[PDB]
């Protein structure tokens, strides 16, 4: 597999009708996965699903601004599961990230970083096996 932590570049930062593919497999008793999409230090859209927190699975999403985290939003829909192969969608649209899981629309994120265009790279962190990480314009 690749190596996590994983930098994927954004060449030229990201546009509505991008379109990012992340595959992996979830550890066993995995923790937490993050992608994080990166305006130089700060973090446009954080999205960080938790297997355990206080016994509970939660995606946490956030933005962070000069090296402070912003309100958290909470989708308590999980559809990641330890020990199985997830596909990640992230389509690019003009006010939102658009996330699906297997398939399956999960969330919407608005655009708090508006400088679209600055949005030039994603880090994918976390209990994972990374198959491929990619992008595509459609
Ligand atoms: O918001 C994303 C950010 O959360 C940090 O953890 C928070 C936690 O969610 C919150 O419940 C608590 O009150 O404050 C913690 C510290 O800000 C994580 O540390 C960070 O990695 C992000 O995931
Ligand atoms: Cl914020
Ligand atoms: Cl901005
Ligand atoms: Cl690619």
Redesign the pocket.
């Given at each position: 597999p690749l190596i996590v932590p994983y930098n994927l570049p954004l060449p030229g930062g990201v546009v509505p009708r991008m379109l990012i593919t992340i595959l992996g497999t979830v550890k066993p008793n995995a923790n937490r996965i993050?992608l994080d999409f990166q305006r130089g230090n700060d973090v446009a859209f954080?999205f960080?699903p938790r297997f355990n927190?206080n016994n509970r699975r939660v995606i946490?999403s956030?933005t962070?601004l000069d090296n402070n985290?912003?309100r958290?939003e909470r989708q308590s829909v999980f559809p990641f599961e330890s020990g199985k192969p997830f596909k990640i969608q992230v389509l690019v649209e003009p006010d939102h990230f658009k996330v699906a899981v297997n398939d399956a629309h999960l969330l919407q994120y608005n655009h708090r970083v508006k400088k679209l265009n600055e949005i030039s790279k994603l880090g994918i962190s976390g209990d994972i096996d990374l198959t491929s990480a990619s992008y595509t314009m459609i």
């Open positions: 993050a954080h960080n927190e946490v956030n962070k985290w912003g958290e």
